[model samples]
Target: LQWGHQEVPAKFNFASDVLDHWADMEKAGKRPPSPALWWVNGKGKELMWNFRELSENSQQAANVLSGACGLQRGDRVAVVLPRVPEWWLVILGCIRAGLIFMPGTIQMKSTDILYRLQMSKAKAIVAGDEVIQEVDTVASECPSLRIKLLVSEKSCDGWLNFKKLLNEASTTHHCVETGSQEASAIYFTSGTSGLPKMAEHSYSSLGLKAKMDAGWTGLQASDIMWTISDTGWILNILCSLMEPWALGACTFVHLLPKFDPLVILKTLSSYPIKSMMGAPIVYRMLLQQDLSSYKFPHLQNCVTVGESLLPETLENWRAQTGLDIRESYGQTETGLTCMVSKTMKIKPGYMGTAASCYDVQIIDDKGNVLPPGTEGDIGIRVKPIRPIGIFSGYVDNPDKTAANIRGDFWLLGDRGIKDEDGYFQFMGRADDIINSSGYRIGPSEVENALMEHPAVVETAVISSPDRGEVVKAFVVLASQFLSHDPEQLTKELQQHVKSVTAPYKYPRKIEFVLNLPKTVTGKIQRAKLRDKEWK
Candidate 1:
């Protein structure tokens, strides 16, 4: 809702609240049983850890970090490791020691890592040996960086060995009395257009994510929650890391060198996972598999985000699994603010209702709130009583932060409209709207229409690079349609989009592709398509 100090609430501190949970569990004699983490390796090897062991290990890691790196409370540390068990321990150790953390994707290149390090002024970096060369190349560029700790034994010239430090240090450490307003982590947004911006959050900010996700997804203490997002993303931090731990659920981590649909399916079948969350593309991929052969009796809930859940995919999943796939929406700047919960009747393409904590509204550029069924920018009303999960501000980017947060409301930069039943249907990003002649067209509208065509497996619509802006659709046809003439199919698809929506919204240019470039999480990298000139 509100940004800056206005969104800062008193009850959001994570370190205090998580410790409280541990204390309460201890008093109730319900301290988590021996095995807290059950990590499934890439080769399908299983590694386990009890809560006591993890807690002790985290303390040991923290103590070692304090002495070796001189990590004081509130110092920022960057984490650039892949999805490994040690990553979780490092995150927890940072939280316990009251140090601020910045999570980076393993997919980030040397230049990207350097930008983040410089932007956050991070004091230390906790990364695996595989990425040490990239870190080394960038370390000299980051003036604030004091320590480089490697997770594996593969030694780099200047990097401290992470495992050796932990083994050599004591396991005793004390938690600092960090207030709710103290900084916790600086989460950088996934930059589809340019360099990523750092979004700062307080201790309260981290704790609030747990509450919001638990409420939106109906996560219970006994649930074995698995969110299929890389630790690099904010959703993973919120859902997979902090939320499940705070709610006392055992988290299932599937460590993979890379994402494979088959690997995900096998893991789903093997593990006793109660709830799972991923992007819509994941559901589409899973639907391609013969799910009837696999028994996922333990999986009761599934959530989709990042993009709209296609109606066909939703229905297909339901037909295969006999369970509804709940869809939720949020961004890096905001956590699970809107969700399609079990309590509500889901309409195809709707993002359901706003969370109880946010006062959401659809508004035009003039800041006037639009009535239901009117498409405009999505805004949140910042009340004096701040919502727990909203972020504080973009680190060192006051201009960008000001543009997003105006007075008591935060502009989400998305175009969507609420229906009479209070369901919000996302249109597209405000910047993504394509204007052709006098018509205003949302790219997603045409993309959705293209998806309805049996031959089209994926589609991305962007403004064609022209003297005059025109709608251009980049279509990735199924293998069956690869032999079909692109020229003939382009005409057919243009007419098809016109039939599906408005006659004026059809793509003037079409590019057929074998595959669409996508992020690790399967979000279509539309910017990649937009960069190419339409022929």
Candidate 2:
């Protein structure tokens, strides 16, 4: 009912407040006892840690950070581990120890790690052995980095030991009382621009991260949520860790070395997984497998974010799983903004209405609310700001932060239209919009249309300079159709696109490629294609 003004408390530490509160409740029998984390590696390694166990483990981890690593309050630590148990303990320890944590993906190379280390001026790093060498590669370049801790039991030449510290450290450490406004974490994300910008969040919001997502996903104590997302992204972190624990719900995580559809399907069938979320590409991969025999008895909710869920893929998935692939919307800067509520109607191509925690609306360039059915920038009012699932600002990047927020509104750099009833239909990213021959085109509209074709595995649409700003599609054909006649297939694909959408919106030029360039995550690097062709 309110636009802003969600207040965070003076003292809030997620570790002590949320995790400890759960342990207290369980001890007093106010809440049922349940595991906070349930991890199973595909090869058969299993780990289950309840709230009490996690609280104790995190306390020891905090001691390790303080005693062995000599890390102090207000220090920043870069975390570059994969989907492992130590990742959760390290972040929790940061919360308990009053240190700001920066989450990085395993996909980052030496240069990427160097950029994060130097920009954040991180004092310490906790990474896996595989990536220890990457951190070592950049260590000489970063004079501010003092400690490099490994998640492995084996010793590294230059890095400190995470396992040894945890095993040898004291488990008795007082929870560091911290103000809710203190910096909690910094997340670096990028869009069309290759350069990543840091989005910082304070303790209160980072602490509340789970609560909001738990509310969105309808998580409960009895539920088990699992996802194929990495700790680097909020989606995976929320679904598998923060959100679940926030609601006393159990979360399942598998340390997937790579995207294995068989492992995912097996986990869904074998475990009591109630909910899951991932990319549309993930669902696209899932549909490639035969789903007739596999059973998902406990899976009631399936969600796909990032891009709009293609209608064909939605139908195909729903037909196979007997579940609707719900669509939700959010950015790294701001968490879940709009999501499909169970009671609300699920639209095929539209992202659902704004979640209760946020007031997401489409506004014109002038900051005026546009009439329904009109496309504009997606903006959030910040007059009465709350830490509620919203980011604080871009760390040390005031100009970028100012550009994102004009007057009282924080613009999301997205293009969309809200219907008469207030549901938002995404047009694409503002930069992803094509200006061609006095017509505006959204690439997702074209990409979704092309996905219906059996030959099209993936595609990105951009403006072509040779064709005078005409639409062009760089498509990755499925290997099965590699031998098809390029000329005939191109003509058929063009005609098919013309049939599905406005004829002018169809790509005039189509170039088949082996693969599309993507970020560490599954996001398409459309700007690369756009720039290459336009140049």
Candidate 3:
């Protein structure tokens, strides 16, 4: 729990080390009376659990997995659900039972879900009933899958009743002790420019649990931190769950099925929230709403990550809330490496200095570290030793893992310039991708799905300038589909993409053109297409 230099302990079990310890303290009446998880559902139904209840519920779910589901240590479990309370139960339960759990968002379609299940060789999947049909479509292909658990009260033919089993199990189970080097979780990289990769991490600092609290979150035991995200988002791991809970603080979970600005303003007034973490786009959405009717007296800390915040949004938030919207930057590979750290001064859109122990340097394609005002590829060089939270490797991807490491530095495919004062200034990425509403979507993914439709010949996708950073597609229709109701075809292509990939990846705006820009050798010049969008 200490912020200073501490090695990832050899025997690191987060379930026991963090959650169980709090539960024990509660039993002995030594710990402060604080809620472990403050949960609200879509219906405004709420449930509050202390550390003891947190442990018992998790232990019960762990027992169900071990006794009824036959899950074991080192086994992999895929959890695909929305902002349900069962999400935490399954994740912590998997931890207690030493089963690796991968969190997937409900936005994932059949193809996305299929790829993950097949690649991970997941043994069991705790999937929401919303995506039940999608899971079944791929379950036959995933030979490694042995058990199917459904979250709904109603069960399908081949699925086990997850809710029924959870209710039947006892509220106690022996915790499994896993070494720090043990595989804990596999996070799917935000495939902004390519296919999603399975990122693996070990127990200790490998997964960025404690490092989050010790770094940008600046969470205290008395703080009530809220991470406004769905369970599927990567931020859910840190801000939603670990950031506050690891520090003995309460995590407020507000389940918002749809983005509503007024509802958010009301929630801020309802709860005594201390720290709030959200995407820059989220702040933009909130500022779009009238904040004159709202009061956030207890709100002290607000941090934005995911994508660059619009300067106007930051100004409005500070003007309305009297709190700085500290911008942070990191990738799926690193949990949260740099931030406008709590102690540092905030520059409008500049991501803060590198957080504790991370040595972020702006480097060129040739492996040379660049000075201030020079934009190039950025890499994180280990200071003394490799930090606890960075991913060790991509699962079953040794070559890519080795490729990412260049001369003792891990080169994540991003472009940023470090200022003289050490703040990393946000620059465009090396590839054509879009970060919309906290979701990182690859252009190629949407383009590929668009081409699958009969109306398409060539297509280029870019982050649209017309609106926020949403996906826009430039299409060169085939001769057959040229004049056959282009507007209707546009809608069809959008729906086609939603069917092929996640709904979120579908291009929102479509433009019909004669040909996509190309290089001398016929390579698609995506940069030219992207440039045109901004123009």
Candidate 4:
């Protein structure tokens, strides 16, 4: 019942400690007989694998890497694939072989692939046909890559067939015994300002926290959980893969090349899915559908991460499903640090209590904890006792890592406020504040107010030049309101913002745009807009 208490083992490997143990229990008829993974594609082709099956398959995959591909322990492998079952096997295999796997999406262009390969100095890569061509163009440029694995039935020149190798390789392989603090995985951040930084995580660090997150997420051993995230983002690993598997729960995955709202509704109605996690944009798109016709008979727990959800979206969802979209907050470095538990009161706009593994606080620039209701940097205390699941440091960028750790607190590069009741509310990024006539205004407040208007669909607010500085909003209008006169709509929207929040924080200049810049994880890239405005 206590917060920030975790006991990690001196030596831990997720593949051996958790997954193989679950398989052994299942074989002895000590655990539930439910499948470990249930995956479907756009054409309704279904695939299911039990815990024992995953253990055997991943062990063979481990053999394929170490024996056939000549990959050794601690080698970095870049994995890029769509929503395929082999994606799970490859990730598990990497863990079993004691290799660091970096996952990327098929949506990445050649330039993006090149940057990742060159930056991480990956020794190998595993991808499907969708991105084989993209990887091939950049494969020769990376001198460190010795193995190119293609997860296909057919063959490509200079690439090893993933399935063929696994089928021939022996399944009797020993998982590497790794120390608790050894690097296990690497995730690249969504570069909004400059190049992405590599966030390296230790084996026991993420494994320990994933178990704790499973409890907070209300996942039981018999539950079926589905999380909507791309293979590239950290959420795919934390929430989708590790969190559910930590409890021997079945992880439901649907492979869709594009976002189809109807498919999501159909899957929810069809499956026995009990728990779900998605970003705010995914829910907003789902709300636009005829939700009354859809029946989620078994759906209960709903969770959201990334951007803050709008109030209207929350109300509409609750009205439809009778479930509150619990909001959780964390960064790529720290996994699921804060969340609203089942016993806590659900605050529509506020992030809930600090997670059981973190001592989250609002602190001043000098790293002193600030009082309630004061705006300051959001930090996680690292001096008193360093929390598990925080990344070791930015790879090859020790200076950037040192810059973020100030006065024994790891600054999250965000501004927020903690209420007297211990609830946290996000203001904006540290540089996202607007300074106008000596008044500080957070862009999220202005953007949230604009979303309350009928004409606006999405918006991004940033500082613009007006004598000193002023709030400027780039808005995407709803289809029904797009035909309205721009000048008149701007005035009406400005008035609506003033009515919702403080008058001075209203956006002085509103520009109607088709869409705002966003990261690969569906987060609005305000830094891009701010750079354009200032530079």
Best by TM-score: 4
Report the C-alpha lDDT of model 1 over 131-242, residue by residue, as the tens digit: 8888888799899999998998576668888888888877666756666767888888786654467888777666765655564666677678888877888887788777
Mark the 10 consecutive residues where model 4 has the least summed lDDT.
Answer: 1-10
lDDT of predicted model 4:
0.87
lDDT for model 3, on a 0 to 1 scale?
Answer: 0.79
- With candidate 1 superimposed using the best TM-score fit, by how many Å does residue 468's alpha carbon deviate from the native? 7.1
Which lDDT tens digits does candidate 2 get at residues 30-122?
876778889988998999988878888889999999889999999999998889999989999998899988989888879888998999999
Error of 3 at 119 (Å): 1.4
lDDT (Cα, 0-100) at 65 in candidate 1: 69
Q: Model 4 segments beyond 4 Å from truth?
A: 1-8, 448-459, 465-468, 475-501, 508-516
CA shift at 423, candidate 1, in angstroms?
1.8
> In model 3, which regions exceed 4 Å deviation?
1-7, 206-212, 432-535
| C-alpha RMSD of candidate 4 | 3.4
Q: Tens-digit lDDT track for model 4 on 1-535?
A: 0112335678898889888888999889997666889999969599999999989999999999899999999999999999889999999999999999999988898999999999999999999998999999888999999999999879998999999999998988899998777899899998865568899998976776786666567778888999998888889988888888999998999996686988898889889999999988888988988888988979988889987777788888999889888889988888786788767788888877788768899999788999999989989887756788777888998888878887868888988899988889887889888999889988888988999888889999999987599999999999999889899999999989999998999999999999888766567888889888889
**Where in model 1 is the C-alpha error above 4 Å?**
1-13, 27-35, 42-44, 212-215, 383-385, 448-459, 464-469, 474-501, 509-535
Backbone-clash count (model 1): 4
Runs of candidate 2 exceeding 4 Å displacement: 1-6, 29-32, 190-192, 384-387, 448-458, 464-468, 475-500, 508-516, 532-535
lDDT top scorer = 4
- Residue 257's lDDT within candidate 4 is 69
Winner on lDDT between 1 and 3 is: 3
